[PDB]
């Protein structure tokens, strides 16, 4: 069907200079290559956070420590305050 044929040939070929050969675009007055693959290519890193979330920050955890190796001057206080609790107990 040459209706279908000529329709599909113009359908294929009229944007084929926008897809097959990159002679960017004749009817569109703004250029097409600085829309999606140049501006909007960094789109998702213009739409999400840059240099922390997309670079993802493989980050070292803060090494949380013990009671800093001091028994004496606080274990005696814990012992005497425990005497005071057992007074109150």
Partner 1 sequence: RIDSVSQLQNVAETTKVLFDVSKETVELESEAFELKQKVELAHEAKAVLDSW
Q: Which residues are near partner 1 by CB under 8 A? A: 44, 47-48, 53-54, 56-59, 61, 64
- Nearer residue to partner 1 within complex by CB, 41 or 77: 41
Closer to partner 1 at the Cβ: 1 or 88?
Answer: 88
Percentage helix, strand, coil for the chain under 3-state DSSP, each rounded to 5: 40, 0, 60
Nearer Cβ to partner 1 (23/71): 71
Beta-carbon count within 10 A of 70 CB = 9
CA pair distance 31, 15, nearest whole angstrom: 14
User: Cβ distance 64 to 57 under 8 Å?
Assistant: no
Nearest approach, Cβ of 32 to partner 1 (angstroms)?
22
* Shortest reach from residue 50's CB to partner 1, in Å: 11
Minimum distance, C-beta of residue 16 to partner 1, in the bound complex (Å): 29
């Amino acid at each position: 069907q040459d209706l279908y044929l000529r329709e599909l040939k113009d359908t294929k070929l009229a944007p084929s200079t926008l897809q097959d050969a990159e002679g960017n675009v004749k009817p569109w007055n703004p250029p097409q290559k600085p829309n999606l693959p140049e501006l909007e290519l960094q789109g998702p890193e213009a739409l999400k956070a840059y240099t922390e979330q997309n670079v993802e920050t493989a980050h070292v955890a803060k090494e949380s420590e013990e009671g800093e190796s001091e028994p004496i001057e606080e274990d005696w206080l814990v012992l005497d305050d425990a005497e005071e609790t057992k007074e109150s107990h």
